[PDB]
């Protein structure tokens, strides 16, 4: 869980970030609230334009799924009723997969969730709470649950998991499970053991994120 | 290949196989698609060729483009699962069908509105161990059923028939013609085709009315 992030790296965007876990590096940018296109307009709430760009080649249907899952996480996080008939552009440029993209998209999704959240924080957009996402995997010979697995570990995995939780009260109370994307062969006992260990490492991540956010933003503010 | 679909590997090549008058019966169903305003299922089986096509009517709905005293109608044919036709040929039939139902649909009752009619050529099997001409009368039957099922006003039950590559659609008990189509065929066979098609037109119209009423 030795992640590293930077905040406010882009000039022509309201907010930006660069999240790095292992070899997975994703840069994200957020502009909003701004004027929306007519087809995007929502009478009462904020409209989200979510874009995911791959590390190699052009955006395909694969990234279209990454956009969809990332939408399921960011939508309830943002206090959308504060910005009626308005738009918020959220762009993720995956710079380095950190995994075999022909087989997995686990680490890229988690890194996009964490980066998007950080970019939303930087942009100063109304959020109902905080959030953290981690990738998890299981190995058949080992029987182990490995949090933040490497690319080599994924190759020999039986199941891959993306867990993103919603935290409140100083990152101590799990408000809800924003996203759990479990793929592969697994049983009910493995699922809850995954959720128990997953919640712990997620809570540790929020604490680390809270540290990063305060370290970067506080110099900008005044005492 | 395509960034919007999964078409598989490019080095892959499709599987190619090797070698080692007649009465017509049809089945009719309407209103089985909750997604739209009107829909119809038309299935026909005869000799060495069966056809199962589905029609769907969406309208009257809003038109962005222009003001209109009367309604606007669009027809699009889509290729089905296995049998395939040229896009040009499907466009041509669409145009031919537009002309027909612009003579039947009471457009005056739908100002600034759009009636979009879709016909899915779902299953067209060719069992012979321009074929599009034999599908045309079944399309008109489906669109007529779908429009009537949608509640769109029609001057008369438009039906048609096919005989030796010649297709002609009738209204008003076969007194008048709302469309004439002819590919291939023979010479000076107009009178024979008109009679044979009117017989099919009459049979289709009876089954259509029977379907719109009893069902």
């Amino acid at each position: 869980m030795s992640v590293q992030a930077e905040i406010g790296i882009l000039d022509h965007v309201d907010g930006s970030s660069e999240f790095v876990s292992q070899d997975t590096k994703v840069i994200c940018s957020v502009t909003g609230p701004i004027e929306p296109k007519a087809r995007q307009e929502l009478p009462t709430q904020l409209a989200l334009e979510i874009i995911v760009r791959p590390a190699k080649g052009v955006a395909t249907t694969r990234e279209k799924v990454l956009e969809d899952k990332l939408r399921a996480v960011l939508t309830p996080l943002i206090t959308r009723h504060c910005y009626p008939r308005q738009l918020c552009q959220i762009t993720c440029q995956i710079l380095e997969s950190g995994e075999d993209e022909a087989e997995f998209s686990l680490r890229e999704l988690s890194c996009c969730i964490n980066a998007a959240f950080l970019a939303l924080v930087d942009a100063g957009i109304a959020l109902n709470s905080m959030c953290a996402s981690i990738p998890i995997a299981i190995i058949k010979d080992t029987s182990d649950i490995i949090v933040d697995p490497t690319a080599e570990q994924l190759k020999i995995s039986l199941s891959v998991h993306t867990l993103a939780l919603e935290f409140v009260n100083g990152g101590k109370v799990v408000k809800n499970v924003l996203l759990l994307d479990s793929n592969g062969d697994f049983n009910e006992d493995q699922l809850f053991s995954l959720l128990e260990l997953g919640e712990q490492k997620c809570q540790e991540l929020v604490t680390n994120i809270r540290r990063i956010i305060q370290d970067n933003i506080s110099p900008r503010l005044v005492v | 290949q395509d960034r919007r679909r999964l078409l598989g590997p490019a080095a892959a090549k499709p599987m190619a196989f090797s070698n080692t008058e007649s009465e017509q019966e049809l089945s009719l169903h309407t209103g089985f698609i909750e997604n739209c305003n009107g829909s119809a299922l038309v299935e026909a089986r005869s000799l060495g060729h069966q056809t199962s096509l589905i029609s769907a009517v969406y309208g009257p709905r809003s038109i962005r483009g222009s003001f209109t005293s009367q309604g606007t109608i669009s027809i699009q044919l889509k290729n089905g699962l296995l049998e395939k036709y040229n896009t040009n040929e499907l466009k041509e039939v669409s145009s031919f069908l537009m002309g027909i139902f612009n003579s039947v649909v009471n457009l005056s009752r739908y100002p600034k509105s759009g009636i979009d009619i879709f016909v899915y050529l779902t299953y067209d099997k060719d069992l012979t161990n321009s074929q599009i001409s034999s599908l045309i009368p079944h399309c008109i039957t489906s669109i007529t059923l779908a429009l009537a099922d949608a509640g769109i006003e029609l001057v008369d039950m438009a039906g048609a028939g096919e005989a030796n590559g010649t297709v002609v659609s009738f209204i008003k008990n076969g007194e008048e013609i709302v469309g004439f189509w002819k590919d291939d065929g023979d010479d000076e066979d107009l009178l024979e085709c008109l009679d044979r098609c009117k017989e099919q037109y009459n049979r289709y119209r009876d089954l259509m009315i029977s379907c719109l009423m009893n069902q």
């Binding site: 279209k64 190759k155 | 999964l6 078409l7 769907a56 969406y58 309208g59 699009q76």
Partner: peptide, 28 residues
């Protein structure tokens, strides 16, 4: 073994009809 590198898949094209004409929706 039971690793993912030894398994294939089908390539599906799903089309949903809703009375519109144009490019593939995000749903499809």
């Amino acid at each position: 073994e039971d690793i993912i590198a030894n398994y294939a898949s089908v390539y599906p094209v799903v089309e949903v009809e809703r009375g519109r004409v144009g490019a593939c929706t995000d749903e499809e």
